[PDB]
Symmetry: C3
Subunit: 340 residues, 3 copies
């Protein structure tokens, strides 16, 4: 919501209250997404300032607050700052910003990240370029300097984060993306490579001094029709773990595939069907394993831009022989979102 | 404060800065409410959206930030999300919402929760229906479908929360309330029952597979006069603990009584006297014990709707033989609230 | 940003998104300020209410959110409530407020706290009167009751905080400040003394039952010129630690000196040079040690009141023989701030 707009500075304060529950068999512990209360809320601000006719400054922060913890010792569980960056935009030169932000490969992966609740499984946070990460400097160019409508590109420097856990760490890295869009049709490619920390290399899963990710996507998006596909691969980048005695690390390689179909009726209903498969390969002591394998069926109903409800059923194709212990049961999310 | 109201959506951003100190003998550790700095602040939003002539959507979030922690390792202590829910309201049918919210029995207990600082002792958070809890679906009806001014009712489903601690856990449960109000007089009843988790049943205090709570209240509230009484009982629901070697659990039964009297002068002063007694019964290895026993004397002075100050003296009737180690000393809160 | 102003109540919601990185040799662990991502964001509110012609009420809260943690187990690291207080201001009598707030000696120390990123080294948080602390009641007087333009003074009661750590604890204490300002020239003095907790006295560094701090400062500030000096001393107040086997405590005495020079060009650039030295004395098992010794060179460029960038190079004069293990390498901060 734009709550402030005076003297060339505007501030959008935004957020939402998601009442949300997951239904899964027994424990949920061997299901796709777990079981129980999942209610949370978001809060954030974007600001933009007109510096002059061509120059623009901006900053943005967004925070997650779980609503399914007690007021006791677990109050903070799942609470995090999702985004925090500032930058500048100049006329037809492009934008530069720095802070915690989405990695370039997410420009690709965003194509199928459209399910009511789930999906976008390959866009892990703090995982190099595939989702939100700390310490990205990002340059982006719009319509190729104003010369070429619908063509964009970005380049990114991700600095190293030697965190406590191998899972959240990364070395210095470089990435980019290009996308073209014409009359509801778009295509995208993105690639990034980065060094692994010593602590990542120390883990029993994953071997090698460079993590790599790339993804391509192709989409149809107009006339109330949404269709999109993603195919990606990774090397040494996808976090994996055993379920029982935690040995963790990274997948030596993965193959990712995301298919999405959705239709937007004028009265507000939007059915959605989607299929997602992700498989690891050359995992040590395992060989090949599926990490994600499912079909999805569900629907969102928009009352208006502020209020919605949705159902998301995950038909989980993993099965309980899975060598990594990936849970095999299904999951339904029912939810109700107010947002401003 | 209503900071946004455009195009059928309105957003109230609200909060407060409470400067607050507790005075108690020596340590405070054997007093009613402790001793030292107690300063905190709240932040929150309510939103409401006109979907059509009869249908309304809303969401709400509210957070607590302690102001009496350092900027070091204890920064987060006492910090929690208090409320997070969304729902819908239809014309004369009622409202439905889901998320973290107040339990129905709090519709009763709210009658005496009016002291400057203390009181409302029986409305524990994360304690089934008596205060704030995660995972309530709540339906409410206003003036009985518009047919009956002043008569309300609600029904609630509380889903299970198998938390880490017995104290914060609960099984699935069902509750309700009815209230009638006529010319400053009101009466209320509320009841809820729920299953206990296995981890609640594992504790040395508390015996039984169902927690129960109910409460009734009767009040006078007009012409600057506030008077209200509450009588309630619980089974297996009231959290209790030893002071010295923590054995915890729940009270096999309790009897609760809350009496409140207050007067609102036109210049802004509002004296308040109140008495509260809560006693446990059939506690294992104890028998009967008082949990709460005190008289209260105090006053709030309202400068206006945004600014106030108050004193709350607790004359603590517990005494230092108390078999559970409930502290026996008195406590005074002096405070200063700005709120927007 | 003033987002609300209706009916005698106004609320300024404010904050910022700092994209920020530190450059230092190797680890950073033996540098002045470390090494890596340092991005963070602030959020806060000030409110003010016209109670009548002379009486004014206010409250304020401000929070820090790090943007350089993951979304995993370290999400909360460095997150804290910085300020939370409320009070009242009466006509020409002065203001009284209570909560978490700046200690009086910070009225002095604020003179040299002007570097782009660093500086203000002696204004530790939760350190009696030198920075932010919990439980201050503060009275302040403006222009000496309206009688004397440019002359101010304050008096402060800091109540005890028996925290878990000696570092964050304090006894009851009393402080004050006076300042005079005439045509861009100002001078300030401030002093505070307080009792130490038993847990502070238990530490191997620091000896004595009273912590003391005082500081004086003298400044020039007009015609785009900023110049200011600070000289201060402490007894039993400055937190010190070994680097390798943590023995901690307080410095038996310190001598502080801060010099600052800055120039504000009309186009927006503001170079800054500054020098800071702080040395401990009578430290047990050490004798004398420098805690801070450096020169600073840097610059901020203001695009406007909302958007800036800066560089701050610390030429670190500590050297790697330092008996306490204070890091000896240099540090450069490059940053980009959006603020509203
Ligand atoms: C198998 C891996 C495949 C990876 C897929 C990466 C896709 C990246 C997009 C490239 C667009 C290349 C140029 C396309 C745009 C041409 C310019 C144009 O369309 O318009 C000209 C007009 O003059 C302007 O208004
Ligand atoms: C000992 C335990 C006691 C528990 C206490 C529970 C109290 C619940 C209230 C019930 C109200 C019952 C109906 C009262 C309202 C009657 C309708 C009325 O008052 O008004 C009629 C008029 O036509 C409309 O405008
Ligand atoms: C070595 C330690 C030194 C510590 C340094 C502490 C400085 C504190 C300031 C004191 C000002 C004393 C009074 C100065 C103001 C005099 C009044 C005046 O200037 O103006 C008169 C006029 O009538 C009004 O409008
Ligand atoms: C007065 C104008 C001042 C100048 C305005 C500057 C704008 C700064 C913006 C973002 C910082 C981006 C920093 C990205 C740093 C990554 C470096 C890294 O990751 O490690 C590198 C290695 O140590 C070898 O230096
Ligand atoms: C302008 C800069 C934009 C750079 C975008 C990277 C190129 C498209 C992705 C192609 C995926 C590569 C797949 C094979 C990699 C082995
Ligand atoms: C059951 C499976 C559900 C997924 C449907 C596949 C549609 C995606 C087709 C990809 C077309 C790309 C857009 C041109
Ligand atoms: C397109 C329209 C989609 C439909 C819109 C739905 C609105 C959902 C609102 C709240 C969820 C309430 C969930 C309450 C669940 C409690 C269940 C429980 O606690 O456990 C039950 C047990 O496992 C046996 O299922
Ligand atoms: C319409 C639905 C509203 C239901 C309200 C529950 C009935 C009033 C509380 C009576 C307290 C019961 C006390 C005895 C229990 C043993
Ligand atoms: C000292 C004791 C302080 C409490 C005063 C009792 C008033 C409550 C009377 C209850 C009347 C209910 C409203 C009709
Ligand atoms: C109806 C009007 C009600 C009255 C309005 C009151 C305004 C209160 C404001 C701030 C509290 C400041 C408290 C500062 C307390 C510090 C005391 C301390 O630190 O310890 C002292 C020792 O225990 C010996 O009491
Ligand atoms: C009106 C009340 C304001 C009180 C201000 C304290 C006096 C100025 C600081 C002088 C520093 C003292 C240095 C020597 C201490 C040993
Ligand atoms: C290299 C050293 C950088 C610091 C410059 C010293 C200026 C401070 C002079 C103090 C003058 C006080 C204001 C009258």
């Amino acid at each position: 919501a734009e709550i402030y707009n005076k003297d060339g500075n505007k501030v959008d304060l935004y957020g939402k209250a998601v009442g949300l529950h997951y239904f899964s068999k027994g424990n949920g512990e061997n299901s796709y997404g777990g079981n129980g209360d999942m209610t949370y809320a978001r809060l954030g601000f974007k600001g933009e300032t007109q510096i002059n006719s061509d120059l623009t400054g901006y900053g943005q922060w967004e925070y997650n607050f779980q609503g399914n913890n007690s007021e006791g010792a677990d109050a903070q569980t799942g609470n995090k700052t999702r985004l925090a960056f500032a930058g500048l935009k100049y006329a037809d030169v492009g934008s530069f910003d720095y802070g915690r932000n989405y990695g370039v490969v997410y420009d690709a992966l965003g194509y199928t990240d459209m399910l009511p609740e789930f999906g976008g499984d390959t866009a892990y946070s703090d995982d190099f370029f595939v989702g939100r990460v700390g310490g990205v400097a990002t340059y982006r160019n719009s319509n190729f300097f104003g010369l070429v409508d619908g063509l964009n590109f970005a380049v990114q420097y991700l600095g190293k984060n030697e965190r406590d856990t191998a899972r959240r760490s990364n070395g210095d890295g470089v990435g980019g993306s290009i996308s073209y869009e014409y009359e509801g049709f778009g295509i995208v490619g993105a690639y990034g490579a980065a060094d692994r920390t010593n602590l990542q290399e120390a883990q029993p899963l994953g071997n090698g001094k460079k993590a790599e990710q790339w993804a391509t996507g192709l989409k149809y998006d107009a006339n109330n029709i949404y269709l999109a596909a993603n195919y990606g691969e990774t090397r040494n980048a996808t976090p994996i773990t055993n379920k029982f005695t935690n040995t963790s690390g990274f997948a030596n390689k993965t193959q990712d595939v995301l298919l999405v179909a959705q239709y937007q009726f004028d009265f507000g209903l939007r059915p959605s069907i989607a299929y997602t498969k992700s498989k690891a390969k050359d995992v040590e002591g395992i060989g090949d394993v599926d990490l994600v394998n499912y079909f999805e069926v569900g629907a969102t109903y928009y009352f208006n831009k502020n209020m919605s409800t949705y159902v998301d059923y995950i038909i989980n194709q993993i099965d309980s022989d899975n060598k990594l212990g990936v849970g095999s049961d299904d999951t339904v999310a029912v939810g109700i979102v107010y947002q401003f």
